[PDB]
Amino acid sequence: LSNWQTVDLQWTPDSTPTPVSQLLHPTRESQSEQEMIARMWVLCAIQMQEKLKSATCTKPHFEKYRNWLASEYERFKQPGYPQVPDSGDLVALSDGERLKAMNEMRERVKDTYLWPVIEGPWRVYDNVVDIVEGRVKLVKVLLKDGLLEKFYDWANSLSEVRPLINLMGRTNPGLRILEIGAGTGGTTARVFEGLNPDAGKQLYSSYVFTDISPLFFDSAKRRFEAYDNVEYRALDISKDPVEQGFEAGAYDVVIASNVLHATPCLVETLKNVRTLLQPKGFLFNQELSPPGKYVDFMVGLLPGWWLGEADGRAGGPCIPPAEWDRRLKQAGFEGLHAVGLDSEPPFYYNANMLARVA
Numbered sequence: 001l002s003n004w005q006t007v008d009l010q011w012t013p014d015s016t017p018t019p020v021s022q023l024l025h026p027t028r029e030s031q032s033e034q035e036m037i038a039r040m041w042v043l044c045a046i047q048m049q050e051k052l053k054s055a056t057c058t059k060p061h062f063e064k065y066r067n068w069l070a071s072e073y074e075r076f077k078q079p080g081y082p083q084v085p086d087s088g089d090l091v092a093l094s095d096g097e098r099l100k101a102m103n104e105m106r107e108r109v110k111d112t113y114l115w116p117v118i119e120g121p122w123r124v125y126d127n128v129v130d131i132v133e134g135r136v137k138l139v140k141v142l143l144k145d146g147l148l149e150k151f152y153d154w155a156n157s158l159s160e161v162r163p164l165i166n167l168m169g170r171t172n173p174g175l176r177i178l179e180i181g182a183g184t185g186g187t188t189a190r191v192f193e194g195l196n197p198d199a200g201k202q203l204y205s206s207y208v209f210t211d212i213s214p215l216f217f218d219s220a221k222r223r224f225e226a227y228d229n230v231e232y233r234a235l236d237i238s239k240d241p242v243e244q245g246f247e248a249g250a251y252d253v254v255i256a257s258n259v260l261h262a263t264p265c266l267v268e269t270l271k272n273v274r275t276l277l278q279p280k281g282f283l284f285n286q287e288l289s290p291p292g293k294y295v296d297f298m299v300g301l302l303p304g305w306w307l308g309e310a311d312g313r314a315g316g317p318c319i320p321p322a323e324w325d326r327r328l329k330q331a332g333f334e335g336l337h338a339v340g341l342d343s344e345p346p347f348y349y350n351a352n353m354l355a356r357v358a
């Protein structure tokens, strides 16, 4: 990552490169909670094996998940499973003792920020048959009691991105910002804090909150009721934004957290982001590329997790920064500009990437 260690916005003659470590960095050491998470989803995954095998996988991708999960379960019975070196002892527990351990982990994290990342995998285990047999949707399962929003709050909690946002806003106090696939608003919430440093100071002219799904807009209008000059408009970034009613080149910063990898073709997606940006504009792209399989476990029951092979992403939709750099160059960006991980490698979750229009 040594070529992407500084940020130089070049929006005013004032511009001096700033070390990325002051602008995008981890908020804390996170190995304990990451190993708590890994431990939990490994326990659920073990507990799912017999349930999955007797279940009727009603769609091809449910079969892919069952097959994938069976192969990962074989990895638990080998030494040195990443972040779970005692995975073998978890396989060695009785079914009843494993249920006891899973419920102890839920009880431990109740009323903490870690609640969604422990409860989430439990719910996947607890509903898997109803899900693969087409009686309940995964997303509905994860929506209950606000878990999805709190889950994305957890992921965002690992990255400190407010100094970068603050620098952009102090540099351009009329910042025109658009966020792709803002969803529950986990990243929107951090970004506004960087744009609102003090009462009576708003370092942006306009925040366009977008998602492909307008179903998010009511709750996000509640969540961000305190902020002025926010719009809420649908947008599919896999398709031309101008034809969808957006103005080409009318934005200084485009924000995207863990949405771009959900699109079928990253280069076309990045070209659509570039269409929105002014000639000196920036994409700030927060994107998973952890080495472990917690995200595979959590969202593998969705058909979209199995796209990627026609887009050079056979192993799954998430790619590390070197791959983003490649595809940014193919889309008219200067490759990556700066990158900061939400943890010291190799056990990080999100790469926080800034890319400039070429």
Ligand SMILES: Nc1ncnc2c1ncn2[C@@H]1O[C@H](CSCC[C@H](N)C(=O)O)[C@@H](O)[C@H]1O
Pocket: 152, 180, 181, 182, 183, 184, 185, 186, 187, 188, 210, 211, 212, 213, 235, 236, 237, 238, 257, 258, 259, 262, 263
């Ligand atoms: N093609 C597309 N264009 C725009 N948004 C999309 C999209 N495909 C998926 N999305 C949206 O991207 C989001 C991915 S979930 C990622 C976390 C989210 N930013 C949050 O904080 O809630 C979802 O809300 C999804 O509806």
